[PDB]
């Protein structure tokens, strides 16, 4: 395997996928609290993104991988709205 690149920064607003795989997919508006560089068993770098879920108390804060995060673009905001509606269908 091979080094990740850090893709998000402290203070950034990002959209985070629901981790529960039993649930219809939805995105949560989140804030990056910390970006921590680690190396895996192969000696390659990966990043742990500690995030806060906007509108929730800090006890809900979690560290996640880049794969579950999206940039806060208009297109991803629309995706979030689409998914939220579908979850309610």
Curated annotation (Swiss-Prot):
Ubiquitinated by msl-2. The chain holds residues 4 to 92 of 512 of the full protein. It comes from Drosophila melanogaster. This is Protein male-specific lethal-3. The gene is msl-3. Coiled coil: none annotated. The chromo domain specifically recognizes and binds histone H3 trimethylated at 'Lys-36' (H3K36me3). The chromo domain also mediates association with roX1 and roX2 non-coding RNAs, promoting recruitment to the male X chromosome. It is found in: Nucleus; Chromosome. Residues 8-87 form the Chromo domain. Component of the male-specific lethal (MSL) histone acetyltransferase complex, a multiprotein complex essential for elevating transcription of the single X chromosome in the male (X chromosome dosage compensation). The MSL complex specifically associates with the single X chromosome in males and mediates formation of H4K16ac, promoting a two-fold activation of X chromosome. Acts as a histone reader that specifically recognizes and binds histone H3 trimethylated at 'Lys-36' (H3K36me3) and histone H4 monomethylated at 'Lys-20' (H4K20me1). Component of the male-specific lethal (MSL) histone acetyltransferase complex, composed of mof, mle, msl-1, msl-2 and msl-3 proteins, as well as roX1 and roX2 non-coding RNAs. Component of a maternal MSL subcomplex composed of mof, msl-1 and msl-3.
